[PDB]
Amino acid sequence: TGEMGILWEFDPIINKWIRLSMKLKVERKPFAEGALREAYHTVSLGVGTDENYPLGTKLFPPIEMISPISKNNEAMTQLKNGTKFVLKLYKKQASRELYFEDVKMQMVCRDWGNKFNQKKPPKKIEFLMSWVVELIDRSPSNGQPILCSIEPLLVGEFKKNNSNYGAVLTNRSTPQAFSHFTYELSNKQMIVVDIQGVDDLYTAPQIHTPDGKGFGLGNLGKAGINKFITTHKCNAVCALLDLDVK
Ligand SMILES: Nc1ncnc2c1ncn2[C@@H]1O[C@H](COP(=O)(O)OP(=O)(O)OP(=O)(O)O)[C@@H](O)[C@H]1O
Ligand SMILES: [Mg+2]
Ligand SMILES: [Zn+2]
Numbered sequence: 007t008g009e010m011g012i013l014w015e016f017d018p019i020i021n022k023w024i025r026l027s028m029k030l031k032v033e034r035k036p037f038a039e040g041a042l043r044e045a046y047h048t049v050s051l052g053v054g055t056d057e058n059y060p061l062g063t064k065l066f067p068p069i070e071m072i073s074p075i076s077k078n079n080e081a082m083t084q085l086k087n088g089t090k091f092v093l094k095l096y097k098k099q100a101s102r103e104l105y106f107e108d109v110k111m112q113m114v115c116r117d118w119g120n121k122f123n124q125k126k127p128p129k130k131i132e133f134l135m136s137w138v139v140e141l142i143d144r145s146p147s148n149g150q151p152i153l154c155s156i157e158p159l160l161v162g163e164f165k166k167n168n169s170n171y172g173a174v175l176t177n178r179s180t181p182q183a184f185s186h187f188t189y190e191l192s193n194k195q196m197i198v199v200d201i202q203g204v205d206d207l208y209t210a211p212q213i214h215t216p217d218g219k220g221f222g223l224g225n226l227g228k229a230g231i232n233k234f235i236t237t238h239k240c241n242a243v244c245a246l247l248d249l250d251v252k
Pocket of ligand 1: 038042157209
């Protein structure tokens with residue numbers, strides 16, 4: 007039929023994780039890849055609760071960060087039986103903490119997207135949902151259990167607009183103005199880069215902060231922030247949004 011998984015959704019507004027179960031069927035070979043990961047077509051065979059699966063503490067995320075109730079979640083509708091979606095694995099290592107940190111990062115970016123839209127720019131944006139999944143049916147050699155992340159399938163022409171280290175790859179205005187927006191309105195505590203997806207539906211972003219801690223692998227601290235600065239040229243969207251040219 008398919009394999010079981012423990013599914014984790016993060017909800018920023020309560021600052022907690024929701025723990026569920028699902029069953030899934032994953033193609034054998036990847037359809038795409040980048041420098042970090044490989045992506046696999048997958049189909050959903052249903053979402054359920056985690057009651058059969060002892061949490062068994064030792065714990066990460068810790069008990070105080072987990073919601074005792076899970077009846078409200080996006081997974082129920084976005085990953086219902088029959089859905090096509092995408093599963094990602096890291097290229098040849100890693101860490102339990104890492105996967106949870108990537109999903110948390112994408113959720114933070116979704117919040118940034120809604121903040122940008124509230125300003126009424128000419129084009130509105132959206133980041134996809136992302137989820138952590140423990141592939142419990144698969145064998146552990148260093149005793150490491152198998153983990154991954156999953157997200158919806160984007161239909162259409164996928165394009166990368168900027169990288170995590172200073173490259174500007176297309177002419178569009180919206181993706182570069184959004185990056186600038188997050189740097190200025192966060193009081194330079196943070197910036198969102200690696201803006202990529204179909205039209206303005208984006209996924210797999212990267213965040214840099216000054217002290218370089220947190221937010222997984224592509225966080226290049228002060229060095230990444232500086233690279234974005236060097237190549238940025240503000241556009242009509244930067245201006246409509248009243249951002250500083252400096
Ligand atoms: N949700 C999605 N739907 C369709 N295709 C996708 C999706 N996510 C990723 N891809 C494709 O898979 C490729 C690799 O995925 P992803 O970008 O997450 O890996 P990566 O190694 O982190 O890349 P990057 O260097 O951009 O961080 C993407 O460039 C894109 O072609
Ligand atoms: Mg990519
Ligand atoms: Zn600008």
